[PDB]
Write a protein that binds this DNA or RNA. Structure first.
Lengths: 216, 141, 180, 83, 33, 20
RNA sequence: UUAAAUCCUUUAACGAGGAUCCAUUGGAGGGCAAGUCUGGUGCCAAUUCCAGCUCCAAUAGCGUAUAUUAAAGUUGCUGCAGUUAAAAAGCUCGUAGUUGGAUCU
């Protein structure tokens, strides 16, 4: 592996410890193998749907495959990738590439009394895509993910153990039904809960501490 | 929009009363005239005397010659056209036979293949067509 | 007017989705190492858990010092400790939601006989219970799904009137010895 | 963020916009992090200290990032009240 | 039978996985009672 | 030959699917 | 046991190798659990009808018809809609109804 971007040089050599440091400064990832370096031993992908858009040509219709894959580590990191290519293998290869570049941390909370590890979504959060609306509601411990099969796959990649779910809109569209539930999951860290009201002590940027190393 | 007053129960109750009638499922079960023209009279099965045997052509994209029977129901005197499971099962039916007749399966709508027939024959001469076709029983005449 | 009682219940609930690959395999896993006859013995233990879980989450929404929460929370927790699915130090209403099906299925008389070394397999245990070879305290039990309390755990004996117990030989051994 | 036993059970604590107090998302690539340097009192020399400003990507799209840092710096002592 | 074929090929246009076209495509299995 | 029925059919199904 | 019986419970005797003391009912080669199958029957290779095999599901049970509930946020108080898809009155005044600014220790 030849690190070609500046983040890649900082992750090939041991100075960036965890992937949360990338997420804390909202730094954009540009390579797939940056995710593989930190926690790549547990990523499992699932080809949800292959859906070709048809552009008819002068010598017959051209069949170009869109691929929908979802991937996670079952501990709080989930992503969804959409990539369009000609054949089956290239489309799913490009889709897991873009799914790796869209890995989002997942905030988990408790239903009540806050014992042990968190298990549910912290609050009622909603995802919207197309006409499809997907709502995630927290549940007591050991309830299970009360969902359709398409969000049952996505929610289990994110490591969420319990969830009440509702849907509205034309959920037959699997692309919109999987993109909307990914929007609801990624909106868990976009919502300000009163346990995060503290005055934020700003942490030194990773670009500026390792300034001497990027010189060489 | 919808009125949200505290003292608007009478208008909210009366409006929902009138707007229920505009659903055809609610009108069929409640007006009562959808059970008067039902040949079964709101029942699940009905017995009748076989009048004759006829054949019914199928739809245009799937051409077939399906064979039915004309049976006159006892309790109300109405004529219905009933379907037999195959052409082999027609060997066990003769005219002036008492047959027990059920619906085909979609609460009043016809077959997705052959139009015009809404009912299927369950028993003939007080024995079942499944036991007759599988050789389990013999029917009296 | 009769002197009869008509009150009766259903002890199981069929799932809404009849054919899904994830639920079919988790149920088959439970039939495997617990030696059950059908899916109904899985759905029965699944149903008795949801009745307990519903009672727990109804008491939890009540405030802490409510006297119905204190009486019936203590009553519910004592019943779970008594059948041996809860530890002594885990007496709280929040720990009930952390139970699973496998904790209840481990307390059956079929499982306890296999765990106590009275049988060679979980299926050998089931046929041994049914054939009147196993007693608890002083009472012979046919029912494999007999849930064993903690006080009955160390008293699962081995049936003094059985060939494997007191010593009267069976029908097969008696018939065979008559041949010679 | 924290259980009843006092243990900290969370992945990370995300930053806030210093202008409008918004949680900056992990995929918010429109945000910035300001490094505005200090000067010496009597000589105007860089002594190594600074204080930082973070602006969320929602404000920067509206075009109100200009008055955002300027208002923060006015209260922070860098820009004088005689502006 | 021919109605089944055009519905299979419509699903083939949609790109979902289909069973291969063979002799047993549209055949009534048995009479239905 | 004949097929097993009851508890022993589930045991044989469990072995063909999970163990092997 | 019981009014007298029966059933259950307790027990003498006999009672299992294909332990023939033999478990069914439905569905699958167009979507959910499950098919690159076989043999008869005929149209100009495709194709009407019939009998089987293999697999899947529940199991002393399992199909079918009909009524009804949930799915249905497709009767919407919670909680739907009315540009172009079903739908806002041609315009204004107007009884009942519904709703009604601030202010008092």
């Amino acid at each position: 592996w030849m690190p070609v971007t500046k983040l890649g040089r900082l992750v090939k050599d041991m100075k960036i410890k965890s992937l949360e440091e990338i997420y804390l400064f909202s730094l954009p990832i540009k390579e797939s193998e940056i995710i593989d370096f930190f926690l790549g031993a547990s990523l499992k992908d699932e080809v949800l749907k292959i859906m070709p858009v048809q552009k008819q040509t002068r010598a017959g219709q051209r069949t170009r495959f869109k691929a929908f894959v979802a991937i996670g580590d079952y501990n709080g990191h989930v992503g969804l990738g959409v990539k369009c290519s000609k054949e089956v293998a290239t489309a799913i290869r490009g889709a897991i590439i873009l799914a790796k570049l869209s890995i989002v941390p997942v905030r988990r909370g408790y239903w009540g009394n806050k014992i042990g590890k968190p298990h549910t979504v912290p609050c009622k959060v909603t995802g919207r895509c197309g006409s499809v609306l997907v709502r995630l509601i927290p549940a007591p411990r050991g309830t299970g993910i009360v969902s359709a099969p398409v969000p049952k796959k996505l929610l289990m990649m994110a490591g969420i153990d319990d969830c009440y779910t509702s849907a509205r809109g034309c959920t037959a569209t699997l692309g919109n039904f999987a993109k909307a539930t990914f929007d609801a999951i990624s909106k868990t860290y976009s919502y300000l809960t009163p346990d995060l009201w503290k005055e934020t002590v700003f942490t030194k940027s990773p670009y500026q501490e390792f300034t001497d190393h990027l010189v060489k | 929009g919808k009125c949200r007053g505290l003292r608007t129960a009478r208008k909210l109750r009366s409006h929902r009363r009138d707007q229920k009638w505009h659903d055809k499922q609610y009108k069929k079960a409640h007006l009562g005239t959808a059970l008067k023209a039902n040949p079964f009279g709101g029942a699940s099965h009905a017995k009748g005397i076989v009048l004759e045997k006829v054949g019914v052509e199928a739809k245009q994209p799937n051409s077939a010659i399906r064979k039915c029977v004309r049976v006159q129901l006892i309790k109300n005197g109405k004529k219905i056209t009933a379907f037999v499971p195959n052409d082999g099962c027609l060997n066990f039916i003769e005219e002036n036979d008492e047959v027990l007749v059920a619906g085909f399966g979609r609460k009043g709508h016809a077959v997705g293949d052959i139009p015009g027939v809404r009912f299927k024959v369950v028993k003939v001469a007080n024995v079942s067509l499944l036991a007759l076709y599988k050789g389990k029983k013999e029917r009296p005449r | 007017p009769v002197a009869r009682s008509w009150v009766c219940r259903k002890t199981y609930v069929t799932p809404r989705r009849p054919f899904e690959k994830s639920r079919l395999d988790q149920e088959l896993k439970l039939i495997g190492e617990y030696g059950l006859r059908n899916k109904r013995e899985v759905w029965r233990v699944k149903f008795t858990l949801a009745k307990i879980r519903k009672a727990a989450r109804e008491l939890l929404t009540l405030d802490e010092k409510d006297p119905r929460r204190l009486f019936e929370g203590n009553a519910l927790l004592r019943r779970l400790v008594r059948i041996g699915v809860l530890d002594e130090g885990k007496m709280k209403l929040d720990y009930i939601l952390g139970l699973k099906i496998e904790d209840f299925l481990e307390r059956r008389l079929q499982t306890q006989v296999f765990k106590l070394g009275l049988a060679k397999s979980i299926h050998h245990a089931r046929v041994l219970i049914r054939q009147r070879h196993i007693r608890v305290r002083k009472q012979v039990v046919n029912i494999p799904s007999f849930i064993v309390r903690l006080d009955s755990q160390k008293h699962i004996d081995f049936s003094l009137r059985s060939p494997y117990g007191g010593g009267r030989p069976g029908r097969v051994k008696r018939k065979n010895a008559k041949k010679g | 963020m924290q259980n009843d036993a006092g243990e900290f059970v969370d992945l990370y604590v995300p930053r806030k916009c210093s202008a409008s107090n918004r949680i900056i998302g992990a995929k918010d690539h429109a945000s910035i992090q300001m490094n505005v340097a200090e000067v010496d009192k009597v000589t105007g020399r860089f002594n190594g200290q600074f204080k930082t400003y973070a602006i969320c990507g929602a404000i920067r799209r509206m075009g109100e990032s200009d008055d955002s840092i300027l208002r923060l710096a006015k209260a922070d002592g860098i820009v004088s009240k005689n502006f | 039978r021919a109605w089944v074929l055009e519905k299979k090929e419509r699903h083939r246009r949609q790109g979902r996985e289909v069973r291969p076209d063979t002799q047993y495509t549209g055949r009534k299995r048995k009479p239905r009672f | 030959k004949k097929k097993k029925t009851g508890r022993a059919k589930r045991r044989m199904q469990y072995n063909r699917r999970f163990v092997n």
